Assembly symmetry: D2
Homo-oligomer: 300 residues x 4
């Protein structure tokens, strides 16, 4: 079962903007040894997934899977794309290379009008990897798709037999809570996606978390998870607050994927390089401010 | 004194002709105390259709609640927010005159304040009309559309609003709420969470109480959750939260707002809340029957 | 027939924040003589209408109606409020003082769920002034009510016999166009509310316009209106662009009701005074920048 | 060589299996020219389900449009926008190779550009893959969510993107559109308006043409409106706009997206557009029959 922390991996790049495949081995080793992170989620927003071409996405997924062998428990490939054909190609490829699962965002240019139409899209991608675990990536802020996750999940196995869970990037814990509450007999992964309030989702039954911060705050987040598991909710909150102090600070400065790349470079010592347009590399001012904040909170 | 635990956002009972039914407020207070274990109320909020009422109506109904709450409720908090500063000041002064326990103010949302500091200045001028009354900020961005974060508003707030004593936070952003709690440890603030259907998630983030409409008729069940949390029976607290979520999600799917709350309260309490005022529309017979059947099936109401 | 430019009037205030009734006569004279504006719309957003108490709204409506006698063609009082009772009081009062009409915004605290419910609210206000022309103030950006104006108008006379038109503050000209096209027999005023693109609504059948800029750009706007009426569309567009150059400039700086108040004071020489909280008086940086731009465009 | 007047945003015909039906593109080109008076097309835009197609499909269908458009259409403009810069560069270079008349690029909207200047840097890199081809910006904030105003983007654009030749503006903000026109008088840019249902409102603000889905099947009627406007018969122009609005508003109330456009084109032209690709769903029989009755009632059939 896909459980605990799942790092949404950054796509390291060379200064010329090509993917830097050569540091992915180091990155896997670092997640496992320094962050206590055993699972990754490849080519999501943090990995600039949809800024990469289909061939780039295949090539980098190959690197994560092969470098993750006998080191990471699970490598999940985000295979979402605006083109169903391209998503199908990526899903089939993920099965071919022996990824542990695939995830799919709802297409978000021409949006699905209904639940049923979205499910039909998802089913056709899942069917391209018909024995691979399939996870829905719920992220309404990005997609504009208003369909509630608990409703999407209702009877989903009848349509998508490889359905195995949800990455829920949304703060509606009625919806998340009812995903958990209404699907007790399915052994689904209920993975929460809003790092800055993970504790609030743990109390409602999250079985793990997928997020960008686990790349460089995995140790402290694991301490929070362990405190929660020990029923020390006061202690777990104190640990959550440490994390919140950092995230709240950088969000006020201007905090997106570019800034995450810069922070990972700073904390890990592994060069993530610049982001790809339409992202812009983080400023020196941001990186200095973030470094100082990390140090003051004992994250660095 | 500190405002804590459950605070029921009270309904404004009305006659079939749309006038306030003052006559049932005493009964309502007694019912909250005896049947729901609710010791605090929040008057003329969204649940109370506060801003649908005239200033004269708001004064009259606040008087009735304060009077009927005497020696029965711990705290009666009057929402005195209005689009007009002048009217809000009038209501704040009146709340002090009648001996309400505190006042709350929503951000004005006809012409929205451009910045935190401008909003603070509006809030300050209202608070200063009741200079011996605890003041609470009512944060509800889904309604107001005011994109000012509560933790930013709270930062150094006592320097501008010396009566500031806390926050009603009706929003699901628990980074904002969490940092309200985390950054304001010395000030003795009430951190009251406003989204009933995920209260347990806010309790784990340091909420000191809750303000909401469901406590009118689910206060007893919610108090069981609070007590489970206090005892560190977190598994039991979650079970209770889920039972509440099963009801709320059911009614949200059907269409669930203030009108429906009025109908549900009438059903559960037997006290006639009456119709809502336009632009709300009375809840349907189908809705009320469905809610009843759900409540019975969850053992929130008797067969 | 309510037609041509209608100034959405500012509420002059004393430095201590009370209404400065003493300058309203001067303001009316200025509108008629210097701006060529013969109609006003009182206590809209520009008038900080809903920042005023019911009593203040009565008082200032009285001053506008009295000072407008034999000078303005029409004085329209915005009587919208969140409280139906307050709206009804203000409507009755507008009828008592002999205002030429009333206008009503949809209440926007608890929004009407449906068209029928909104019309029922409007009907109950209109019925308090049962022989006074009634105008709907459509402004979905403020109210969040998303029902199309053409749908709201369909059959409206059956429930609101005093209905005589609308102020349309929205850029959807399919909706505005169809308001005009579908209501040809009823002699309605189709008043456009987005000053910065007035010409675009004139060509679609607008019978007039209600806005803040006509307080201080009425002369130029009337030249545009006259060019449009005479079919000189090249000249109409050039005059529209003059106005747009100013508005585009100030919107980039931050442009709302407070800034309108400051601009009116600068242009007219009549002291509008400070705005009421939650508005804040315009900055010196704003007024210096705006003054320079008005001069560069021959508006000052 | 100036892109002006109507530009039909072309549909991607598909067979029932969802594969591209290349075989009817010649027929479609002839229909546009003969029956609709449309001389320009905009390929693989929203109406074309462009971002639902793979890069290989977009190349193939662009080839077919360019080939079948030779000596028939005045201009074939290829939308080469993509979320991936590398993919957009490939499509831009390909459009130049096949002899397309121009390219257009939407702002990427997966991870949105923080500023005008960062968006320009993306657009510049795509334009630079087709460095002799006219470049058009495709502005459609309702779909992308990118809150960067067109007039700000256009301001001094030629210094960064020397092939910049105009704008497809699919937005109702005519302060933005008006200032695009007003502030760029020296440039000979195409100011193509993208909201068909209110085109007349943009014509009065200085639009030099229009790009849209309705010109596939209402092009003849829209050309009558354009002619009335150019001939200073503005009352006639409004009458024509209102007739078009009666149809569009009728379908807007029912649910009017790309699926419905495919079905209406099939109905009007007799050329089979086929179903749309997921995540779109084919229009209903009810809808098609309703649209047919409405078109007949307005003498559009």
């Amino acid at each position: 079962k896909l459980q605990g922390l799942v790092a949404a991996t950054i796509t390291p790049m060379t200064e010329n903007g090509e993917i830097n495949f050569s540091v992915i081995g180091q990155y896997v080793d670092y997640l496992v040894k320094e962050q206590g992170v055993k699972n990754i989620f490849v080519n999501g927003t943090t990995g600039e997934g949809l800024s990469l071409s289909v061939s780039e996405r295949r090539q980098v997924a190959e690197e994560w899977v092969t470098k993750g062998k006998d080191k990471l428990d699970q490598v999940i490939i985000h295979v979402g794309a605006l083109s169903l054909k391209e998503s199908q190609e990526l899903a089939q490829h993920a099965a071919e290379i022996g990824a542990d699962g695939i995830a799919v965002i709802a297409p978000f240019f021409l949006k699905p009008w209904t639940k049923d139409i979205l499910i039909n899209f998802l089913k056709e991608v899942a069917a391209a990897a018909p024995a691979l675990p399939f996870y829905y990536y719920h992220i309404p802020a990005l997609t504009g798709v208003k369909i509630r996750a608990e409703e999407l999940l209702d009877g989903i196995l009848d349509k998508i037999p490889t359905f195995q869970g949800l990455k829920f990037s949304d703060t509606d814990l009625l919806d998340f809570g009812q995903c958990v509450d209404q699907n007790r007999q399915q052994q689904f992964a209920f993975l929460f996606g809003v790092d800055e309030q993970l504790l609030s989702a743990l109390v409602m039954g999250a079985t793990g978390a997928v997020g960008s911060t686990y790349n460089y705050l995995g140790k402290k987040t694991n301490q929070m998870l362990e405190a929660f598991e020990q029923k020390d909710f006061s202690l777990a909150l104190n640990y959550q607050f440490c994390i919140q102090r950092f995230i709240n600070f950088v969000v006020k400065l201007g905090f997106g994927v570019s800034q995450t790349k810069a922070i990972m470079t700073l904390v890990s010592g592994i060069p993530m390089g610049p982001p790809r347009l339409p992202l812009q590399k983080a400023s020196r001012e941001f990186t200095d401010s973030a470094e100082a904040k990390l140090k003051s909170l004992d994250f660095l």
